[PDB]
Scaffold this motif. Structure first.
Motif, PDB file in Angstrom:
ATOM      1  N   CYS A  73     -26.460  47.380  -5.353  1.00 38.69           N
ATOM      2  CA  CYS A  73     -25.367  48.614  -5.334  1.00 38.69           C
ATOM      3  C   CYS A  73     -24.826  48.430  -6.865  1.00 38.69           C
ATOM      4  O   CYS A  73     -24.914  47.479  -8.169  1.00 38.69           O
ATOM      5  CB  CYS A  73     -23.783  47.489  -5.011  1.00 38.69           C
ATOM      6  SG  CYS A  73     -22.534  48.772  -4.976  1.00 38.69           S
ATOM      7  N   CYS A  78     -20.925  47.321  -7.773  1.00 40.33           N
ATOM      8  CA  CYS A  78     -20.612  46.426  -7.368  1.00 40.33           C
ATOM      9  C   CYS A  78     -21.549  45.027  -8.538  1.00 40.33           C
ATOM     10  O   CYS A  78     -21.199  43.572  -8.244  1.00 40.33           O
ATOM     11  CB  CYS A  78     -20.777  45.721  -6.255  1.00 40.33           C
ATOM     12  SG  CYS A  78     -20.013  46.016  -4.798  1.00 40.33           S
ATOM     13  N   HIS A 132     -22.173  50.538  -0.815  1.00 39.25           N
ATOM     14  CA  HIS A 132     -21.630  50.161   0.257  1.00 39.25           C
ATOM     15  C   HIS A 132     -20.284  51.283   0.361  1.00 39.25           C
ATOM     16  O   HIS A 132     -20.496  51.548  -0.014  1.00 39.25           O
ATOM     17  CB  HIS A 132     -20.846  48.651  -0.110  1.00 39.25           C
ATOM     18  CG  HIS A 132     -21.533  47.165  -0.749  1.00 39.25           C
ATOM     19  ND1 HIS A 132     -21.511  46.791  -1.702  1.00 39.25           N
ATOM     20  CD2 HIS A 132     -22.286  46.244   0.439  1.00 39.25           C
ATOM     21  CE1 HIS A 132     -22.315  45.555  -2.018  1.00 39.25           C
ATOM     22  NE2 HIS A 132     -22.345  45.130  -0.228  1.00 39.25           N
ATOM     23  N   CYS A 151     -17.891  50.529  -1.309  1.00 36.99           N
ATOM     24  CA  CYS A 151     -17.467  50.838  -2.683  1.00 36.99           C
ATOM     25  C   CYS A 151     -17.285  52.074  -3.384  1.00 36.99           C
ATOM     26  O   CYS A 151     -17.107  52.891  -3.513  1.00 36.99           O
ATOM     27  CB  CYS A 151     -19.181  50.351  -2.742  1.00 36.99           C
ATOM     28  SG  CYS A 151     -18.910  48.584  -2.901  1.00 36.99           S
TER      29      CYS A 151
END
Ligand SMILES: [Zn+2]
Ligand SMILES: [Zn+2]
Length: 69
Positions: free
Chosen positions: A17, A20, A40, A43
């Motif tokens: 990710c 993140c 995600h 996300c």
């Protein structure tokens, strides 16, 4: 998660990710921007709220076209 060889290569590549700035995890449900790249789910959401462009490929996923809340 793979490739397995078989067979890379296209929609649903994943990587770390990047929103993140961290590896993905078997934590919750996940989701790809229809650019190609997976993130995600949570996300892809808060990202869409801030950056209306793919973080990796850098371009607006499209001009379209939800709303939404
Ligand atoms: Zn994330
Ligand atoms: Zn992308």
């Amino acid at each position: 998660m793979k490739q397995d060889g078989e067979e890379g290569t296209e929609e649903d590549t994943e990587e770390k990710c990047t929103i993140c700035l961290s590896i993905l995890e078997e934590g919750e449900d996940v989701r790809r921007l229809p650019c190609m790249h997976l993130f995600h789910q949570v996300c892809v959401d808060q990202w869409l709220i801030t950056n209306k462009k793919c973080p990796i490929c850098r371009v607006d996923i499209e001009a379209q076209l939800p709303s939404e809340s």
